[PDB]
Amino acid sequence: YVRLDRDRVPTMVGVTRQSRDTITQPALSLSTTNTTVGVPLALDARAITVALLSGKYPPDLVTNVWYADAIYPMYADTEVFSNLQRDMITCEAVQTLVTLVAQISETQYPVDRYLDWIPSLRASAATAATFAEWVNTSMKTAFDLSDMLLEPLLSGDPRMTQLAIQYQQYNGRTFNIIPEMPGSVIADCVQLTAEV
Amino acid sequence: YQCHVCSAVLFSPLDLDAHVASHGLHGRHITEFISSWQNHPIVQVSADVENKKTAQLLHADTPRLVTWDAGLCTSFKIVPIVPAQVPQDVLAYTFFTSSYAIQSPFPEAAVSRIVVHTRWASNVDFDRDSSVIMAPPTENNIHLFKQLLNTETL
Amino acid sequence: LPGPDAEKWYSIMYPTRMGTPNVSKICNFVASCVRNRVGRFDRAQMMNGAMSEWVDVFETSDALTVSIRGRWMARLARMNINPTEIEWALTECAQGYVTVTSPYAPSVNRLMPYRISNAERQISQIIRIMNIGNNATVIQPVLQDIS
Amino acid sequence: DCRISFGMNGAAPMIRDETGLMVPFEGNWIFPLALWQMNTRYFNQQFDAWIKTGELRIRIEMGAYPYMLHYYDPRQYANAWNLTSAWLEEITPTSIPS
Amino acid sequence: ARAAFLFKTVGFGGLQNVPINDELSSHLLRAGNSPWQLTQFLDWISLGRGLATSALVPTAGSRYYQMSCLLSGTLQIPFRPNHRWGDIRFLRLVWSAPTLDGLVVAPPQVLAQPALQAQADRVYDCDDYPFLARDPRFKHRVYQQLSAVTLLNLTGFGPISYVRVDEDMWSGDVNQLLMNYFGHTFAEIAYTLCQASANRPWEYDGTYARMTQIVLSLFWLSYVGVIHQQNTYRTFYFQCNRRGDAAEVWILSCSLNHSAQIRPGNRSLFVMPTSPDWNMDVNLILSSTLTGCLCSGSQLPLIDNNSVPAVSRNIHGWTGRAGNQLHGFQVRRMVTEFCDRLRRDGVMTQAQQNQVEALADQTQQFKRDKLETWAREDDQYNQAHPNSTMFRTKPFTNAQWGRGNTGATSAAIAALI
Amino acid sequence: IPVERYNILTNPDAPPTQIQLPEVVDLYNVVTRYAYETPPITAVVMGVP
Amino acid sequence: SFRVALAGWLYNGVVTTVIDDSSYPKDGGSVTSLENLWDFFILALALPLTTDPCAPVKAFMTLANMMVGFETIPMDNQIYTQSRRASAFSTPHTWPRC
Amino acid sequence: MKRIPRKTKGKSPATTEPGTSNREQYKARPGIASVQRATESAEMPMKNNDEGTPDKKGNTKGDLVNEHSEAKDEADEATKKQAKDTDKSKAQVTYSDTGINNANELSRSGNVDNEGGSNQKPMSTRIAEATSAIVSKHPA
Q: Is this entry keyworded Kinase (chain E)?
């Protein structure tokens, strides 16, 4: 949030699939097509002003009692641990997809090429999209999932290298965040299986 | 009747054993909370089951992780290919009057081979249902390799 | 093994158990084996009741599956935490309006796999951001319920 | 910041002082009323046996309070546990009786 | 493999008799009549809030010392030439069974006659008592506690711990069974291992022994400040939530791609604290108890006679002419050295170090005040009651609050890596 | 019968843990088995005066 | 709407909350009209709660539009005048030099 | 050992203690049920948006609608759902007709495939015809 410093007003958000040492098609993501930074939403001014001019507390409020009684039943139904496990699995799946799709395309990704002696063709976006969809379905089946997993990655060119995010200032400056991937046990196990 | 570890109120000694085992004391809920200023415990049970007897359902779809196997940790199995039988000097071995029949680690056959059959000798609680199954090579296994992108074959 | 017919599995699991009654290829293979490596040879000092926590056994397995499962076991073990950390987290999250406690007895066979890194959470967040795709029907419930 | 830790294999349970030391349930304690108010059920179930039979004495800081009087014949046996147990158990986060 | 089983009893603290009396001795038996159960020695607080206290047992070290005194007094009964187990009393206590199953109040006939006249600084051999000679399992389960008693009783300072560095004891699959321990605090691991040790006799070079040795070495190496998040011993280290606080919590942790280079060869040393702060922490007593459990099964190198007074010299299984000397350290200076190493390596800044030092200073002053007040109360009680002299805590002196030989021990620990 | 698959039996020098991946998959090995516990998450909530 | 504003504080990066375009005066607004003055009051107290980065410019340009014919400010462009509606200033390049 | 089903298809002495009596009388403020229902509604995760993504044999999933038309249609649908949720006829908080000229906005749909072409004809059909063009038969 910036108050009146115009040069620092942010108007763009973008998601990047390719590494920082390649030149490719400028396939910008969908979020960039908004006039604003995000999806627009309209509010009624009259309701906000009425809510500002009127408002009160109970004449018998003790904040400790109120907030104990508010927090106990809200925290008693918490789902953060399941979310953490879900995030771990999501990251594993993304890394597995990248490693396996490198093997059947021209991706500029360093992976030990073991199964090169098996005949193959050179895959375009449609073939790689089908292959990636099959991989996603298999992983969901193994871990008994039913909601979203790797779905947004299948909706374009799935021959990716690296996920990253960025945003733009008014004066052209940019901010780029690239998560530093830890290991991935599934991918290493698959590479070991290929070696055998 | 009550647990001194957590200040719960219970109605059974076997349920007392379950409760104390929840704390780690040696004698399906996933979370449980209690409060100190009134009598109102809260538990959470997965929204998978139709039973919600006063519990709170958990919508989060989280992947199965910890799973157990009680069989053999082997994925390759030995199958006989051409059968055969041959006379022998010894048939069974005797202790006093009872006889015990000889049994071999490997099949008695003319030719036998190795095939891939994941978790053929396992015993699991949860099944991940991703088996790769190979028939002996005297049969046909083409559907193994034609699975993925062969929708429009001639 | 659990269930019926455990003697068939006795024959399958331990090749050396069959003697050398006849002359054949199998008998030669059995006579080539050493006799002191069939069974269990290592158990834990810690035990519940009268059975140990972990055991090492000689069995008919294969190396590749054992390697896969060992790597998976290590991956799960790196995620373990303990209830005192649960206390600290839920006490700090509440901003000091309540306090949380979680009694427990000492053990090392307990497993509560919940620890991850920041990069994994950031990757998941980026995935969730791409999921919206300028569809307002995705975001309307979130704002409505939070309000 | 009083926190109770349970006892194991015959070791007495303990509660935390202001100094940081952890003490067992016998002595002379000083409490403010709000601490008992905000943890009513837990405190009852932990301390009532030791107040009734043990050697625990607790000073509750109240400031001003109403009171009720009960009279009895001195020549006969008299015990006041029922009245005090009722008073202790009827304490809630927002109210107290006479 | 250990083959000599000798133990030494406590000495008097200037008094005329054993520093325990009837009230203290009967107050100890909380988990039963047997002085052999672990709960008689250690207390499971289960929180990092810590600092348990009582009227008769002010600290953890108090309980450990009182148990030591009780055993030192009681065991002198069966060890007479006659070898009878319940014919005489020590402070109106009698052994209730030949296999030392528990302690009871004396029979009226025994109470009629005078008690045993105990003498201090005695060295006894387990093989002299015939039932200990006959049953190796019995000797095992008793020496588990006797060895820790000796480690306390050898010197006038805190208890002794043993640290070994060796890349040859990591062979096999020990790495996985160690990775199974991630996320547990040091207290949990130490308590569980000590409890497990008594179940059955174990091998000197087996997995249990190498596990205990690796745990001890990792704890001490991280405590001194050599091993941290950005310099790990085969990816293992211990993380402290807040150093210098009254009760610290150390948690086993894994870090990738920062493994330190370890020279080949086998080396070891003996370390101990000298300031009275050892009464107030739990980690050091847990380390000493693990060392005693390890000693009950395996033979460790001898301690040089130069480090111990003449009463503790030439003990057949514990001391010798040539051996390892004891390295004594002081707590508050070790905090500064830990912060120095961590800040020098870049994990720590200067402001965090200053915060740690403020915590350490105020903690030390608080603990010192409490210990002095308790000592004064003890002396006054002894003056009031000349027939029942006692000490709730092992005696100390003002000069022990000094810095003596701290940096030398830190350098010696750092030289292991 | 291929003695190479059964190395740790046929070789009197082979230490028990040794494996020969990726060249040769062995058919006789050492397996480690556990009995882990997995409790729920239990919490006690107390008020702040 | 009041609760939704606070909810949308958390998700600045994907959703931008603005005031409805009908909340401004109808044709242009004029300072001679009492209703338009109350419209200005309501809009001016409503605006600071949104995550729109151009709220202050719209707050200024509302009164700028309503004051046409009574006070004049210097405009640099010959295409964009004082009569450009306040809603249209929705991106940083629309901010005037005045 | 207990078998766990799959929610998803596979590939086919006096006992009495002094203080334990339950005569406490307390009502919460705020009440447990109200916050419990609100938290239950907030627990729900986001919906899966699979429009524009491949099927298991290569065909695209979605409807044959233009992308900007798709975005405007979705904004209308979300506004109607908001009006339904607050029980009003007209929504106070709206996603359409907001005063922002957002005319370049694009949304996923079934009108394009992964190589950038149109789905006027499914991919499998195109593969089938391109293959059928090269078949040969037994000699006459």
A: no
